[PDB]
């Protein structure tokens, strides 16, 4: 039941997570 997580900040990823959405919402310098 361990999931893949953003490798920068470890926030859990689901089936609807995307790299672009996640970077845009949560990251600044990357």
């Amino acid at each position, epitope marked *: 039941k*361990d999931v893949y*997580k953003c*490798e*920068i*900040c*470890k*926030m*859990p990823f689901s089936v609807y997570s995307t790299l672009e959405k996640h970077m845009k*919402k*949560w*990251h*600044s*310098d*990357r």
Partner: nanobody
Amino acid sequence: RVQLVESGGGLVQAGGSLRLSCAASGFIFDSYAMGWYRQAPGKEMELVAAITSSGSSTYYADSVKGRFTISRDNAKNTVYLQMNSLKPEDTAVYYCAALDYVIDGYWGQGTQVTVSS
């Protein structure tokens, strides 16, 4: 060049409350999303809560929704974690950090949280 001063932890009974704080320096605080993580002995680290740079969105681990509130005070370079209805499962050392740099592995001392049954 980054410093993270965390405090507010302690020993508390189940159902009680705590308020963690982290004052940050060495970067432009208001430019970065911030996260509270917890690390319990021998377990996987968990991102407990996170808040965007603008304070506009927040994230919570499923198990703390409705119980924890993350906020930021940019006038004090500080992030807060309000923890209500604490459970023994919340016991751990809590650490705050900028989301962008968690992979670089530089952490503050954290603040210890112990919830008695």
